[PDB]
Amino acid sequence: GLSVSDHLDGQLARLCEVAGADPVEPRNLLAGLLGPVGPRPLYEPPAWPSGVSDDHTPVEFSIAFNEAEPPTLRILGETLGSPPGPLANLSATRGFLDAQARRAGLSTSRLDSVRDLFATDDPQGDFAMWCSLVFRSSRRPEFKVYLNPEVKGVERSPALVSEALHRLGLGASYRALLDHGVRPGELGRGDRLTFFAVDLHDGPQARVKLYLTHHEAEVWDVTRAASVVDGVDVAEIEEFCVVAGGGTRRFDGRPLVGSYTFTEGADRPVGYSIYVPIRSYVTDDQEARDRVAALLVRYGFDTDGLDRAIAAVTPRPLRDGVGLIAHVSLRLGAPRPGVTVYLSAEAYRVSPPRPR
Numbered sequence: 001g002l003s004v005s006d007h008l009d010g011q012l013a014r015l016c017e018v019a020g021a022d023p024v025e026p027r028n029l030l031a032g033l034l035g036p037v038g039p040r041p042l043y044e045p046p047a048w049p050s051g052v053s054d055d056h057t058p059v060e061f062s063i064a065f066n067e068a069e070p071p072t073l074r075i076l077g078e079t080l081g082s083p084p085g086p087l088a089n090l091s092a093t094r095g096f097l098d099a100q101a102r103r104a105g106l107s108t109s110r111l112d113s114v115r116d117l118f119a120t121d122d123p124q125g126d127f128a129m130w131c132s133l134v135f136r137s138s139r140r141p142e143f144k145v146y147l148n149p150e151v152k153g154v155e156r157s158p159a160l161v162s163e164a165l166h167r168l169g170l171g172a173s174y175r176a177l178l179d180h181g182v183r184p185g186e187l188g189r190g191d192r193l194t195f196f197a198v199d200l201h202d203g204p205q206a207r208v209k210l211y212l213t214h215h216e217a218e219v220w221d222v223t224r225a226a227s228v229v230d231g232v233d234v235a236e237i238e239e240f241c242v243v244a245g246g247g248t249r250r251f252d253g254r255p256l257v258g259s260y261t262f263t264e265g266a267d268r269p270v271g272y273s274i275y276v277p278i279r280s281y282v283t284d285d286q287e288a289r290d291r292v293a294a295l296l297v298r299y300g301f302d303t304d305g306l307d308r309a310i311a312a313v314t315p316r317p318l319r320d321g322v323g324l325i326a327h328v329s330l331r332l333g334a335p336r337p338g339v340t341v342y343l344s345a346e347a348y349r350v351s352p353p354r355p356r
């Protein structure tokens, strides 16, 4: 019988061929990230309701289209404990990341400096720590850590994020977001602090990427939130949302997510990205593919790379389900702007399509 590894490793191997990447190191890191899930039978129900994907596959693929280099392949995921649970999953994922940091010779002083702010014996929200494996063309893998700002409860998330950004010397620029970028009194309610992301290795400057989930959000409000970042065109963000959402002005299905890239010596976030959960706003993956293709065409990206990446993940007819194309994002500013497409493993379930 097929294992979870057999399924996911097959997808990664074919995606590597599409991106023109040597598969040895990516496949070794995916095996490490999966931990005890890898060998489990594919027929076996998920050991944990992983928040990583709708069908609880604990990984998600993405292809980031770039202006000046070939596409970037990424894996988002977590290492389940034995047995799985909030702290057991955190411990297993941290063990994987720490071992990979030691192997690659990374310094984790920045991540280590804020680590103690997120630590709790009673972690809330079904995730504490995820990571991303990043496979840029002709480069060694890069690692990113996603921390849950709500891990000590939603009420505590603003205090936690303020303290974390300040430790990294970004205390002045965070005020700009919360003063002028959050809906009045919607902090921890309509506007949720959902991810705190760092690039595992310290690097010269303290990418923090702070992600806000805008629940039942009008694009009017999400574009106002984005305007705290210098150079962001509200018209462009609205245009991305109307095309990706298919006419939706109120995202009352799965919510819009915005990310703010915080950097040293900046008065405000330097980079902004918008993530549309397009699967919530389409009949099926043929419609999702057609909308993502339209967005790539507008931005002068080749759609053949999109189609080859879809084909690498699954041979299923795109009309036969929804949620293969889980999200599409627009990345503005430094360091590497473009469009990202998020592709579901569908290890356990294909979400049924809506009739046309």
Ligand SMILES: N[C@@H](Cc1c[nH]c2ccccc12)C(=O)O
Residues within 6 Å of the ligand: 051, 052, 053, 054, 060, 076, 257, 275, 277, 327, 342
């Ligand atoms: N599946 C979760 C987490 C997630 C995976 N990929 C994402 C991309 C953007 C935002 C969230 C996510 C969600 O849709 O919320």
Ligand SMILES: CC(C)=CCSP(=O)(O)OP(=O)(O)O
Residues within 6 Å of the ligand: 062, 064, 074, 076, 132, 144, 146, 195, 209, 211, 273, 275, 331, 340
């Ligand atoms: C918020 C989540 C879980 C994923 C989207 S952010 P990412 O790491 O996939 O991509 P970038 O930081 O935009 O390169």
